[PDB]
Design a protein around this ligand. Structure first.
Ligand SMILES: [Mg+2]
Ligand SMILES: [Mg+2]
Ligand SMILES: [Mg+2]
Ligand SMILES: [Mg+2]
Ligand SMILES: [Mg+2]
Ligand SMILES: [Mg+2]
Ligand SMILES: [Mg+2]
Ligand SMILES: [Mg+2]
Ligand SMILES: [Mg+2]
Ligand SMILES: [Mg+2]
Ligand SMILES: [Mg+2]
Ligand SMILES: [Mg+2]
Ligand SMILES: [Mg+2]
Ligand SMILES: [Mg+2]
Ligand SMILES: [Mg+2]
Ligand SMILES: [Mg+2]
Ligand SMILES: [Mg+2]
Ligand SMILES: [Mg+2]
Ligand SMILES: [Mg+2]
Ligand SMILES: [Mg+2]
Ligand SMILES: [Mg+2]
Ligand SMILES: [Mg+2]
Ligand SMILES: [Mg+2]
Ligand SMILES: [Mg+2]
Ligand SMILES: [Mg+2]
Ligand SMILES: [Mg+2]
Ligand SMILES: [Mg+2]
Lengths: 155, 81, 121, 213, 50, 122
RNA sequence: GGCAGGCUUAGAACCCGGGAUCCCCGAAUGGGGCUUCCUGCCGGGGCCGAAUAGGCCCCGGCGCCCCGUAAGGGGCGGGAACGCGGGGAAAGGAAACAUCUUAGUACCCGCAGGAAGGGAAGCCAACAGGGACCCCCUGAGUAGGGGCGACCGAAAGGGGGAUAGCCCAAACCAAAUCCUCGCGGGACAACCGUGGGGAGAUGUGGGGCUUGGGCCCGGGCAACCGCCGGCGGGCGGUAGCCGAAGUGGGCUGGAAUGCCCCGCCGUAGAGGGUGAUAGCCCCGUAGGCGAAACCGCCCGUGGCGGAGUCCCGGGGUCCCGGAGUACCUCGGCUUAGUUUUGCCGGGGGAACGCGCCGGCCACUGGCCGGCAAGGCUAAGCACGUCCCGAGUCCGAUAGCGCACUAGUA
RNA sequence: UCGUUGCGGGUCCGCUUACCCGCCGCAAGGCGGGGACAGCGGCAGGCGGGCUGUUCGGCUGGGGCGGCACA
């Protein structure tokens, strides 16, 4: 069984000191250096590698050492390498007309802010929510109805 | 190019009296094409070609043969009579 | 190839709109036990020139030679299952192939022996 | 989920022509068919007023603990002769309820052998009841694929999936066969009524002690 | 009109060809089920928009 | 080189009924920039070519000048360019990448069996 | 569902795959088009004719804008819905109404794909740490916006689906490069040799991509990175083939599948047909087998190229690191973004790694996090013309407007 | 008023190449006049029913005028 990296959930000020663990994106470069591989070797072996992470967790190191020992002793089959196996690039037609050049990206706001925070994204998201009648868009005026009802029932 | 022959009363009278054959041909055929087609297919000499387009959308040609060939005889030869 | 859907509308649509090469399968009829022991097959498509025994209807028990097969209606005309119209002409009753049993096989067609060997295999 | 066409009865070019024409003020056809009524639920060809909506909630959710408690209650109901008879099973010939057979019965792989086992254990009369009580139901279900209404006869419980007894007994009329971990109310109480004629294997009875609890 | 264009004349010829009820043998073949044709018309009543 | 007129876009005064917020003209501009407008105009002039980028060059009182770079994706000299392949398309058969990656992985395990297993176990 | 005459056992009909034909208009493209038809020039051919004149007819070429040295190539139109960019209301609500909402909606213009868009930290956090992106559940109608009214309304974080990382420019070298064509070799390829032409010092190519690099030195291959899709094999799709057991005795009946009695199969009692209600009459079902041809996917193998570009160790403090950009101001649209969202227009307008950017008003100091203004990227997510399946759906005034020679008259 | 707006000489005078206007010319360019004004874009103030959206309360011996018996 290929191990999965364990990382700390970030301890927010709201939490007040309660900390928990989660599945990380990949093993750190320090953790991999602890066992004697770089990012290329680890990805060839099929491990998930997160070159961005700075932390080094001993549980991650122990799991890596154990699984690598099974792999080198032949009692385990590594998965396929964690590298791109396909290269599909489509011909681009009308990039200027669809606003995919640099000027179009700047006008759409992707240079300055995130895609989720751009205005076209907000428009599409609210349109989809209103069409499907999703979480908050199933009722219009839900907040005001809640406010008045809370006032009446908690007076 | 020739679709068929017209063997009506008017066509038979024209054949017997004026040495004319009446044919139904393609709507795009010209007088030159009709005359050459008649001469090639039947080996007669064409005197002149009059053409019209019927109200049912077909081109009808009155082919007057030269004065050595019989329209009635040619009709009997082809057996469309 | 005849629908595998369990819905009666799809079943009836497939049966009614089946092309001719599929409607040939609806002419299958049980062979007699003697023909089964002779040929090694249990069913064969009814063919003109076969002799069949009518197992149901007014003409039950009548054996005759199949004079005509209609693939479109999936019907067969059997000699003896006849009647007279108002003008005196004799007409055949259209019999479904599933209501007859084949007692004689018309095997003069080379393709029919191939079908027989395929079913006996 | 069931529904109608969302635009059904509503895509005609129609309009109310007001009062003064001596006719009722419902919407009517605009064109050559002018005085013909249109779009109202009381008009021929008009929209259906309150049709079924595909977003309607048909599922009645149940708490997991409540569902398991009901399953335990139904299993307890199978052990009584009175409940099974009240449901409508023939249990005169059965030696004892709760009815349990040895674990060797799971190796039977043929319908004839399974029928012999049912005959020797006294469940064949109930299977006969189902087979003779199949009927063509009244109404429009015949056109929609519900032509035959068949009774329930015997629920067979095996220890695990892929035992040959499942394929041996699954062709009997009204007989349901499930592994013990796949027990559910649909087989335990058909019609919403408790007490089903159940044949438990011994290994299934052992396996039951750690399930639905 | 006395003076016609050929396209309009050909469309009129198509209407003239199509204007006819189904044949009696077709009626007998269909067992009196096919009696009328949608292309049947009268010159004074139904007008082609040629 | 594309020359165009600067200023806000030609906003139209509505000729039908509007609420007062929707009747303004002056100061209302388009969400497109003149650079993207110039790119689209050059793309119209050169049909079938693809716009790669563009850059401002100069201004006068009335006009703004841009330079638009366009590529012909049907040219063999453009198809194989590592940058222009992102615009003109590029495919790699999966058998090539999968085979090479599998061979690399096999050789890496074989090497690590010698060079890393004793250090790992000790 | 008629009357004839034919085709077919020399193998038809029918089904599947591959071809041939394919009128005129139509992006329509030689030019016109108030009639889906008419007509021009050039080249070849035919006919009338005494003729080689003249005339008529047939066939082929001749649209605009572009790329390319040329040869040659590209765009145009369509598609039920979905996708991307732009322009952009009112009715209604607010119990009047203008800010507001409705709504960045209806609708319009433009542009793609089988999905699109997004995507690889000038990030988020808060001194503890996450670690590209999209989509789903939640955070949450919380923060916040708002005649603080109606009403509008996140994000971080957590749980999942899925998983993937790279390149261009520059530093340094300086034509070592690429395209095309002829010939010879080379799985029909890539590529190799050779010769001509085109691009290219206004820089082809090498190198480089945060685990920054260049530069210098040392050691080692498990080097690294690319090009072609030939050969073999497997699987699946586009027709099909096989597949158990009563047509038993009597009754009623025009006719039984019904009733009484008696047998049988069941991995098959899903369902339909047959002269009334059929597990065993038939099609089918459980289950199994299958393609000359075309198509798709996986596996093994095979041919070739590069400037060592790969890995490890040390040195450095020299070089490179994206502009009307960042930023300021005015007007406007938008946004939860509020002295604080994004963008467009007018005006002003940086620095350079000893630098620059961010950490909910501005500045200062500390601390923390990063490297904008260049390009790409599978998977996981939308839709329904179409194909398959299902149904506590309707059952001819119902259900789609259309169960039918309905988008028809 | 900001920009377009440049070149000289002492806020003013001059110049032309900008820019504008007309003539000739297929075009290339030439001629003449004006000239950093004008025109043009942004911002700001004034006039502005030319055009867009709205509001023109209630009680009431029917509505209106009146009154406020509207606090
Ligand atoms: Mg809301
Ligand atoms: Mg004439
Ligand atoms: Mg309806
Ligand atoms: Mg309910
Ligand atoms: Mg009824
Ligand atoms: Mg009239
Ligand atoms: Mg309004
Ligand atoms: Mg044309
Ligand atoms: Mg298009
Ligand atoms: Mg509404
Ligand atoms: Mg209102
Ligand atoms: Mg109003
Ligand atoms: Mg995609
Ligand atoms: Mg994409
Ligand atoms: Mg909104
Ligand atoms: Mg270079
Ligand atoms: Mg069969
Ligand atoms: Mg059978
Ligand atoms: Mg940078
Ligand atoms: Mg009725
Ligand atoms: Mg109807
Ligand atoms: Mg001025
Ligand atoms: Mg001004
Ligand atoms: Mg007014
Ligand atoms: Mg008022
Ligand atoms: Mg009043
Ligand atoms: Mg008053």
């Amino acid at each position: 069984m290929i191990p999965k990296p364990v990382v700390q959930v970030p301890r927010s000020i709201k939490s007040g000191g309660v900390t928990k663990w989660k599945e990380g994106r990949g093993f750190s470069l320090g953790e991999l250096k602890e066992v004697g591989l770089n990012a290329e070797q680890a990805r060839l072996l099929g491990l998930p590698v997160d070159t961005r992470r700075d932390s080094v967790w001993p549980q991650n190191v122990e799991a890596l050492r154990k699984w690598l020992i099974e792999v080198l002793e032949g009692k385990a089959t590594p998965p396929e390498p964690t590298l791109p196996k396909v290269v599909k690039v489509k011909r681009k037609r009308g990039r200027a007309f669809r606003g995919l050049t640099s000027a179009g990206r700047r006008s759409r706001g992707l240079i300055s802010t995130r895609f989720r925070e751009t205005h076209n994204y907000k428009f599409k998201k609210k349109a989809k929510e209103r069409r499907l009648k999703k979480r908050h868009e199933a009722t219009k005026g839900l907040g005001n109805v809640l406010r008045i009802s809370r006032i009446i029932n908690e007076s | 190019m020739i679709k068929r022959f017209v063997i009506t009363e008017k066509a038979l009278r024209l054949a017997e009296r004026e040495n004319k054959i009446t044919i139904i041909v393609e709507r795009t055929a010209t007088k030159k094409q009709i005359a050459d087609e008649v001469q090639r297919l039947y080996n007669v000499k064409v005197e002149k070609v009059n053409t019209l387009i019927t109200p049912r959308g077909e081109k009808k040609a009155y082919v007057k043969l030269a004065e050595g060939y019989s329209a009635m005889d040619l009709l009997t030869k082809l057996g469309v009579l | 190839p005849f629908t595998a859907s369990a819905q009666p509308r799809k079943q009836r649509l497939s049966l009614y709109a089946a092309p001719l090469h599929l409607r040939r399968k609806l002419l299958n009829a049980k062979l007699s036990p003697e023909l089964q022991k002779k040929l090694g097959v249990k069913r064969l498509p009814v063919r003109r020139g076969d002799t069949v025994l009518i197992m149901r209807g007014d003409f039950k028990g009548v054996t005759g030679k199949v004079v005509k097969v209609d693939l479109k209606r999936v019907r067969i005309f059997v000699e003896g299952a006849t009647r007279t119209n108002s003008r005196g002409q004799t007409v055949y009753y259209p019999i479904h192939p599933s209501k007859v049993m084949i007692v004689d096989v018309d095997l003069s067609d080379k393709a029919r022996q191939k079908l027989i060997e395929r079913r006996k295999r | 989920p069931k529904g109608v066409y969302e635009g059904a009865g509503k895509e005609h070019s129609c309009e109310s022509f007001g009062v003064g024409l001596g006719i009722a003020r419902i919407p009517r056809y605009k064109g050559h068919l002018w005085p013909r009524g249109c779009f109202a639920p009381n008009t021929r060809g008009g929209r259906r007023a309150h049709p079924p909506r595909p977003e309607k909630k048909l599922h009645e959710e149940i708490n997991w603990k409540e569902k398991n408690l009901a399953i335990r209650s139904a299993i307890a109901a199978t052990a009584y002769k009175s409940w099974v008879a009240a449901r409508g099973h023939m249990v005169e010939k059965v030696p004892s309820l709760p009815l349990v057979v040895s674990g060797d019965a799971e190796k039977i792989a043929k319908a004839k052998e399974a029928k012999k086992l049912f005959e020797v254990l006294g469940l064949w009369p109930d299977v006969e009841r189902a087979a003779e009580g199949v009927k063509i139901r009244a109404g429009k279900g015949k056109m929609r694929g519900r032509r035959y209404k068949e009774p329930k006869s015997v629920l067979v419980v095996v220890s695990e999936l892929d035992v040959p007894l499942i394929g041996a007994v699954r062709n009997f009329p009204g007989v349901d066969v499930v592994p013990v971990s796949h027990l559910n109310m649909l087989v335990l109480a058909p019609g919403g009524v408790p007490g089903r004629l159940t044949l438990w294997t011994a290994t299934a009875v052992e396996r039951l002690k750690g399930l639905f609890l | 009109a006395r003076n016609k264009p050929l396209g309009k004349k050909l469309r009129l010829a198509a209407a003239l060809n199509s204007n006819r009820n189904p044949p009696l043998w077709v009626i007998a073949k269909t067992k009196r089920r096919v009696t009328r044709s949608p292309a049947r018309r009268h010159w004074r009543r139904q007008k082609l928009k040629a | 080189r594309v020359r165009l007129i600067r200023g806000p876009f030609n906003r139209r005064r509505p000729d039908s009924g509007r609420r007062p917020k929707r009747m303004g003209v002056y100061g209302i501009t388009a969400w497109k920039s003149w650079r993207q407008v110039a790119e689209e105009r050059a793309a119209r002039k050169f049909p079938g070519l693809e716009v790669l980028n563009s850059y401002w060059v100069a201004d006068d009182g009335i006009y703004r000048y841009f330079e638009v770079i366009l590529i012909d994706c049907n040219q063999p000299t453009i198809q194989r360019d590592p940058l222009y392949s992102g615009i003109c398309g590029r495919e790699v058969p999966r058998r090539r990448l999968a085979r090479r990656l599998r061979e690399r992985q096999r050789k890496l395990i074989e090497h690590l069996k010698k060079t890393l297993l004793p250090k790992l176990k000790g």
